[PDB]
Amino acid sequence: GAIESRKLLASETPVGQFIPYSHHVTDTIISTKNAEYLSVWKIDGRSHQSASEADVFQWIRELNNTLRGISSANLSLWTHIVRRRVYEYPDAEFDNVFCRQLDEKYRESFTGYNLMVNDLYLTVVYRPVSDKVLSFFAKRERETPDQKKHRQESCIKALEDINRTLGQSFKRYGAELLSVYEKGGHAFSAPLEFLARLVNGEHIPMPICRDRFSDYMAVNRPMFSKWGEVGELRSLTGLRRFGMLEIREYDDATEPGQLNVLLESDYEFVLTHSFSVLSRPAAKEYLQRHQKNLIDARDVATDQIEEIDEALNQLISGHFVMGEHHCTLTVYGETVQQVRDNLAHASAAMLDVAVLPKPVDLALEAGYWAQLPANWQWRPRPAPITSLNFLSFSPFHNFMSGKPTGNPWGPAVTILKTVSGTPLYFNFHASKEKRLLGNTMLIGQSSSGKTVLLGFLLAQAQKFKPTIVAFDKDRGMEISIRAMGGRYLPLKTGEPSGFNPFQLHANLIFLKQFVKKLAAAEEEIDQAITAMMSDPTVHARLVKWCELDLSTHQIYGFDITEFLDNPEARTPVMMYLLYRTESMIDGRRFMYVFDEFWKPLQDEYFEDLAKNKQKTIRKQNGIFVFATQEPSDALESNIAKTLIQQCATYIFLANPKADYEDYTQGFKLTDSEFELVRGLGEFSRRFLIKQGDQSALAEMNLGKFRDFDDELLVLSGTPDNAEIAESIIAEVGDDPAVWLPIFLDRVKAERS
């Protein structure tokens, strides 16, 4: 009843009691009802699949060493490996028939593959004083409002110092600090979105208003079961059933990555680790209790005595501090049976390693509120563990997965499958090599997969409608270029192409054309050719023995295989082509794409222009895509030094004739990375991608999956196939790129 509803809601308990949060005191730091200031770090974890066993231990040691300075009793850490289904990546929208059909087939190819990606968030709080008893006595007293301001200022300074130290320690990791971001004339809070995701189960943007964060944080009604191990969230989007789990037993070993098995899995979940550091007084007291109870041995074990004796020496003089730890895992599922079987799978996975978990019952809401970083009192099962062991449980290992959406130019260009099993959202822009660098270098050894991969990336990157200029070799991508809207402009011998060496400011441009035209010299022709350029015995010889329209298309190519002998052809060719395309760089998105470095080496001044022009175009929607069929001799180039330095995304294709020396000195990659790379035998499809410092052995495949029938031939590059398809194109003569069916008949001989 209407009065009955009122009296019922008056009885009802709000959820704001369990959400201890308040105003942003600082752009990066959140307050708390109990003055426990908070900051959330969004970390892009280090790649661990490289499987460098000793380096994992070295990473753990370094993390402990850097954390030592920050380790003090007024501190805590909450780690949340949230693993989520992704909806942000949108289906691409296409115009050209070939690219659209390739997109359709590839999207159909992922029916049955998990698209979930896991991202790691570390939240660090700064409780002012961690007294066991004195805190309770101090809590019940009023304080001077100016001295509360003093506590504010000191706590903020300390927490800012902590964040700076952690950011300096996490250089190899992602190390991104979540802060306020404004949108639409009103401020928003990025950290609030993470806490909401923890408490609401869905990513809901949270505007910051004058009221306190706790009152309006929750928009979903939680319904924890009575006498049950799972709970249900009621939301407009849907009803989410979440089940929790707890760890009750540990092992001594703590070999790092004991929990990594959960990362690659098929159940969406949230993993919590809280490390409430404990003061050295209480630390040695806890240690001494175990020491004494062991001394009550009665010949219990002889080895354990000298296993524990080193503990005192290491605690006093080592860089580790004891801590309070509980682990809680929250599996999200749409039905009660599904979440229960997910919990069974997770318990099996935990029991695989030496830890023994037990489902949490009678404390479901306690464990659930323990997920919030600021909830000290709701810790269900705090246990004393070594700091080394904590880093062993949470080593920030993550299968590399590029940003699906929010990347520059929008969504991730492609989604690539990974050997481990986590889908990789490929994208050209990488964090470190301001505007993100889009450089890429597709080194490989005589594998047609280079042509196939490059053609597939071009066809999929058609989604942005970007201007692309290509310099192919061996007629590899003529068919691919013709498939989308583009003009090949083959530079065959015996017929000069559509452009003549002349061009139509312009005198300044043609000046260097005169200079490069100077071959078989170069002092008397410094300006004697220039004056004739105002408006050379061998020069007119080349002019008589030489044996265009732009912006009407979006994709271009150049059959530049001919000029592998005389740069005085190749050098003016690149000069003219680059100067031609320079105009369209600022017009819209651009992606230069190449296939060689020795012809670019033939320029001897392309480096001089490029050293600044690559930055200049890079500022305004500029991207280079570099390729190399002989990586071994690539780095020898003087320009190759800049090539390796400027690269952002490094992609390696299986090279049986791999070099340790080159791939170590340049192409910077670890020894285990090199062993993995050389492990790729010849003709294996998989190709390592070192996008940023993280790396992953992503692979691409095109086989029937229960398709690609026409595109398999089109992506590849064959002189016979290319010339024959040129014969068809000559026969059809149709600018309607949809012309593909007519060629599909001539496929009869090749596909017989």
């Binding site: 703590t254 990555g257 109870n293 009678l362 306690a366 099962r381």
Partner: protein, 104 residues
């Protein structure tokens, strides 16, 4: 399959997580509750007030040696799931996202 590996290059925990604080086989806080109950009985009668203590205390000790600090779990249950009202009406414990409508 897993970054975990079978190696002896280990950081032992020492299993000090079993030797959590205790005085006479039990944590003091639950034993404080036991003493409070014994005093409550001493309000009714003194003959068996002290007598009731060893049975309950031994139960506490034997439970704690099995699964330590389970009493914290018991307290959390009593505090959160038990104290909540209207459990039957919603079919489960519920917490309204919105604040009190009146709040006056």
């Amino acid at each position: 399959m897993k970054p975990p590996q079978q190696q002896h290059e280990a950081f032992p925990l020492f299993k000090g997580a079993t030797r959590l604080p205790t005085i006479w086989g039990v944590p003091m806080i639950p034993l404080m509750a036991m003493v409070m109950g014994v005093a409550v009985i001493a309000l009714t009668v003194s003959i068996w007030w002290w007598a009731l203590v060893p049975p309950l205390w031994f139960i506490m000790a034997q439970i704690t040696k099995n699964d330590d600090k389970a009493f914290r779990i018991w307290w959390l249950w009593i505090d959160t799931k038990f104290r909540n009202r209207n459990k039957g009406f919603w079919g489960a414990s519920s917490y309204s996202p919105a604040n009190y409508r009146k709040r006056r």
